[PDB]
Design a protein around this ligand. Structure first.
Ligand SMILES: *[C@@H]1O[C@H](CO)[C@@H](O)[C@H](O)[C@H]1NC(C)=O
Ligand SMILES: OC[C@H]1O[C@H](O)[C@@H](O)[C@@H](O)[C@@H]1O
Ligand SMILES: [Zn+2]
Length: 1016
């Protein structure tokens, strides 16, 4: 029986929204612990029968790209770290080391000779070298989609299982800029038992330390029972470096970082250096160190203390290993043999720490508090809130979501069949998965890497996109060709993908025009794929070389179509205006595609000599003073002109939208009768402070509230069609487009911040909704969390990640903005939503990047805007920390993140073409998704295995009866099932053998993975 995720408010010891509402956030000088207080302890707490057990855990933080590329770091640093770790752990059996980033480990291990491979396996098997988390990367937690977090986790852990025979159950996340409960959600469903985090607001650290609530059972905000709970250790101090990990006083801790004595070119900023430990100083050195340890121990509830020992790209040099080990070993021998300290200290791993903690727990020595909520937005000091990276490098943030979908579609389309090794399907998929996985890094998607590194990530993602296209088009050709005719050349392009929104019109001219002519080719077959497990209709568009084109399905039934011009916007440096030009050689044909669950549908575009019976033509109206003609070649309807004026548009039975004379939305009217609800789009700009701390790739430090962009008298293009209408306007830095297809409008912004330095461009919605100080934003496209605007915090602190959506509501009305890209946003006043488009910053913000953000490029941001009445919806109570989408808002999100894929047959004639694939696939309830379908075995395996990740969201009950839907049993999607197993989300561990070989559907908010086994 499913837990109810709406109506019962979990009773937790710490609820982060509630904590935020009560805490003061005062930035007072706490002493040597600058953001804390002078910790005191009772020397008598520890004694002979109750010792402080201390685990010193060596580690090295390796970025897969930041200041250097992945490969540059691997060559310069990481290969030497790992080679030295191998040698040193081999030679010194007591020494320990933890490793997080499997992308680097896999790269290293692959290059190892067999002898060294065996030595590596042995130091892993005996517990000396321990993998923590074991993801491809240590991902960003703000911008990343949960699906990509899981992908990168699986990529690393799958490698680890195969080659190292280990699956980590403890996670180490020292570096993401703030933390998401999406992590324990995924980890707990992937066999994890424990996790550790570091970058949380200094006020939160202070507050939880005071209550000894730095270790907690982290459960989801809607989880009443507590089954999602994962034990979490928050580190207490400012950094994960050695000076901030031994205890409260960095001036003391720095003296126990033995790499800082001079020969390594490092020093202690506190002006007191480390000194080599000798018999003459060991007593006083131990006095100091033990005192730090005991202070740190006061902040926690057991007699087991974690002491991380490391920093960025540490343990690189042979002499570094020795100097750390030998000095710590002198300290341990003295400390452990001095009874008065009542301490037992040793090198340990992370799992060792957690094991001992839980032993203390089980001996009744400690009980841990429960917690729900998130740890955004991070500030490491004063008013330096890390909300900048929610937006930095928006082009690549958008690319992430595009590749996210291509990877899923490529894996799904090819999963239906087993492929010969010659097809190189597995090879292309692995490359795509790894490149997408790499980008999840906390300097990848965050946009906090150097310019040349950002370029590396883009190059890597482009190759992944190409790999996905190859797999997809080979798969379509196979699924839709009579088997006895199917004749694959595995290097041949049977279909080319056509993507309307990536890179996007005005970003790159990348789409092929379907070239038809009564002297060249009369028709073209196209194919749509629907990765979602339900029947779907969506308008699709193609470029064609003639406006006289009509559409049929493969039963030759006419399909109603619309033809519109191809409009491109140009910043005209002669006229000094941004205005549209119509193509005289290409046209857009638009029609409604209908596609089976997880399936494919074929249509045919055919040329004629004159206007086809089932194809209409959009009117076009260019609104501006001083117009000139806009010829459209063969297009059958003349462009009309007018002075700027308010306009109103309605497609189908849909909403009626009213626009200002500047081409911006002003109101939405849901039905013929209802109010024109005030909903105004506005573009504004934030600056940078002229003195004090400057905004950079990480930090958002505005010089006050945003100011309106001066719009002048912009050119407005109105296109009106039976299937699709739109209003587009050429604003400074933005071509803003409102598109209507009969439901919630789509918004597209072609954002080109040009050379406007020290500017952040925000898009704001102004309504009269009585939201007060409440708004909702999502975490990793997984869940919506209630936010409260706090005026006791600066503007930048009220910014949150908008990875896929945000909304405001009152008793009666909700406005939901859904995104096709992660960006930063807020509700800075009742009735408002805003979301940053791009940011261009001249200065570095002193977090190590060593540069500003001056490499902006045009990006096409996409959105859906959903205005709804919600007075009839069953919503959570006022004290519940979650929110939930409606059915319409959820479908709108799916249309942005997982649209229909479009394929154009690349040759003249497709012999043996079939009309449809998947017509017999079950059409599942709308809240359910097949997030992943992946074949897990190569063709040579006798027993074939296919993995499925199944996710159910939770949608509001608002009085709309449920359509008739079919039970989806993933284990019976493929023929000849011999076994169905429930597994961890990584597919790595079998959890339940399933009766009747039937996969149950999952509960609201839950995610399950299944593997079906098949006789081959
Ligand atoms: C891997 O580790 C397991 C322990 O869980 C061990 O029993 C087994 O022998 C190892 N498997 C292989 C294939 O070496
Ligand atoms: O200061 C920010 C910076 O901190 C460290 O040096 C690393 O974790 C980087 O990945 C990160 O970007
Ligand atoms: Zn890092």
């Amino acid at each position: 029986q499913c837990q109810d995720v709406v109506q019962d408010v979990p009773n937790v010891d710490v609820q982060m929204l509630e904590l935020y509402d009560r805490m003061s956030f005062k930035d007072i000088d706490g002493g040597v612990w600058k953001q804390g207080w002078n910790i005191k302890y009772d020397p008598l707490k520890y004694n002979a029968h109750h010792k402080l057990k201390v685990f010193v855990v060596p580690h090295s933080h390796n970025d897969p790209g930041w200041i250097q590329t992945f490969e540059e770091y691997y060559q310069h640093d990481t290969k030497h770290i790992l080679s030295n770790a191998l040698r040193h752990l081999h030679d010194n059996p007591e020494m320990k080391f933890i490793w997080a980033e499997i992308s680097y480990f896999a790269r290293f291990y692959h290059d190892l000779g067999e002898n060294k491979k065996l030595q590596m396996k042995s130091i892993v098997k005996n517990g000396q070298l321990e993998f923590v988390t074991g993801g491809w990367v240590m991902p960003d937690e703000a911008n990343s989609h949960w699906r990509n977090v899981l992908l990168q986790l699986t990529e690393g852990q799958t490698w680890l299982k195969q080659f190292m025979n280990v699956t980590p159950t403890a996670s180490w996340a020292i570096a993401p800029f703030g933390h998401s409960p999406t992590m324990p959600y995924i980890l707990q469903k992937s066999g994890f038992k424990n996790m550790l985090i570091q970058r949380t607001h200094y006020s939160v650290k202070k507050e939880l330390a005071q209550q000894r609530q730095l270790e907690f059972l982290w459960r989801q905000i809607w989880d009443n029972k507590g089954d999602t709970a994962l034990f979490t250790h928050m580190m207490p101090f400012y950094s994960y470096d050695i000076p901030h990990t031994c205890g409260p006083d960095p001036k003391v801790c720095c003296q126990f970082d033995f790499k800082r004595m001079g020969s390594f070119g490092l020093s202690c900023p506190w002006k007191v250096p480390p000194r080599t430990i000798s018999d003459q100083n060991v007593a006083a050195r131990s006095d100091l160190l033990v005192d730090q340890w005991k202070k740190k121990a006061e902040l926690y509830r057991t007699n087991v203390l974690l002491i991380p020992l490391g920093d960025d790209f540490r343990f690189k040099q042979n002499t570094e290993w020795d100097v750390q080990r030998v000095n710590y070993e002198r300290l341990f021998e003295h400390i452990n043999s001095q009874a008065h300290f009542n301490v037992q200290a040793q090198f340990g791993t992370l799992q060792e720490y957690f094991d001992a903690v839980h032993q203390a727990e089980r001996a009744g020595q400690a009980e841990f508090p429960t917690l729900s909520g998130d740890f955004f937005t991070y500030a490491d000091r004063s008013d330096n809130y890390w909300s900048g990276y929610y937006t930095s490098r928006p082009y690549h943030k958008r690319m992430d979501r595009v590749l996210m979908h291509y990877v899923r579609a490529a894996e799904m389309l090819s999963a239906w069949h087993s492929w010969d090794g010659m097809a190189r399907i597995e090879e292309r998929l692995e490359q795509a998965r790894r490149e997408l996985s790499l980008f999840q890094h906390h300097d990848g998607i965050t946009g906090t890497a150097k310019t040349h590194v950002v370029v590396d990530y883009e190059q890597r993602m482009q190759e992944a996109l190409k790999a996905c296209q190859m797999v997809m088009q080979q798969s379509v050709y196979r699924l839709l060709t009579k088997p006895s005719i199917y004749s694959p050349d595995f290097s041949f392009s049977y279909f080319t993908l056509d993507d309307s929104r990536w890179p996007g019109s005005g970003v790159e001219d990348s789409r092929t025009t379907i070239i038809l002519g009564e002297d060249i080719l009369p028709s073209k077959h196209v194919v749509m794929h629907n990765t979602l497990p339900h029947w779907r209709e969506q308008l699709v568009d193609f470029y064609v070389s003639s406006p006289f084109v009509s559409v049929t399905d493969l039963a030759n039934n006419p399909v109603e179509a619309q033809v519109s011009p191809v409009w491109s916007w140009h910043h005209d440096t002669l006229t000094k205006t941004i205005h549209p030009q119509g193509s005289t050689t290409k046209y857009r044909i638009i029609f409604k595609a209908r596609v089976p669950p997880m399936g494919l549908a074929t249509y045919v575009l055919t040329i004629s000599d004159s206007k086809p019976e089932h194809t209409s033509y959009a009117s076009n109206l260019l609104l501006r003073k001083n117009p000139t003609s806009l010829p459209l070649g063969q297009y059958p309807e003349d462009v009309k002109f007018g002075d700027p004026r308010e306009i109103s548009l309605r497609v189908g039975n849909g909403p009626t939208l009213a626009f200002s004379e500047q081409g911006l939305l002003k109101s939405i009217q849901l039905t013929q009768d209802s109010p024109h609800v005030p909903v105004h789009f506005k573009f504004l700009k934030y600056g940078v402070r002229s003195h004090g701390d400057r905004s950079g790739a990480y930090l958002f430090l505005p010089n006050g509230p945003a100011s309106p962009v001066e719009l002048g008298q912009p050119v407005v293009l109105v296109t009106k069609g039976k299937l699709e209408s739109s209003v587009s306007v050429g604003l400074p830095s933005v071509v803003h487009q409102t598109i209507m297809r009969g439901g919630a409008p789509e918004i597209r912004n072609l954002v080109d911040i040009g050379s406007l330095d020290n500017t952040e461009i925000v898009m704001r919605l102004e309504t009269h909704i009585d939201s007060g100080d409440i708004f909702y934003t999502d975490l990793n496209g997984l869940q919506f969390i209630k936010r409260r605007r706090l005026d006791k915090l600066p503007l930048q602190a009220n910014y949150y990640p908008i990875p896929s959506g945000m909304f405001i509501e009152d008793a009666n009305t909700r406005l939901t903005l859904l995104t096709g890209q992660p960006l930063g946003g807020s509700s800075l006043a009742s009735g408002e939503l805003e979301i940053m488009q791009d940011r261009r910053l001249a200065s570095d913000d002193e977090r190590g990047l060593g540069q500003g953000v001056l490499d902006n490029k045009p990006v096409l941001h996409i959105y859906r805007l959903v205005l709804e009445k919600v007075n009839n919806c069953v919503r959570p109570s006022k004290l519940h920390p979650a929110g939930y989408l409606t059915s319409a808002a959820h479908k709108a999100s799916q249309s942005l993140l997982d649209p229909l894929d479009k394929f154009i047959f690349a040759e003249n004639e497709w012999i043996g073409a079939q009309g449809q694939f998947g017509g017999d696939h079950p059409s599942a309830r709308e809240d359910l998704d097949v997030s992943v379908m992946r074949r897990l075995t190569k063709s040579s395996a006798k027993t074939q295995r296919v993995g499925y990740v199944l996710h159910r969201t939770n949608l509001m009950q608002c009085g709309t009866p449920e359509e008739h839907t079919q039970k989806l049993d993933v284990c019976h999607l493929l023929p000849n099932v011999a076994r169905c197993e429930r597994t961890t989300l990584t597919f790595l561990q079998n959890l339940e053998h399933l009766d009747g070989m039937v996969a149950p559907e999952v509960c609201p908010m839950e995610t399950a993975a299944y593997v079906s086994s098949h006789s081959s």
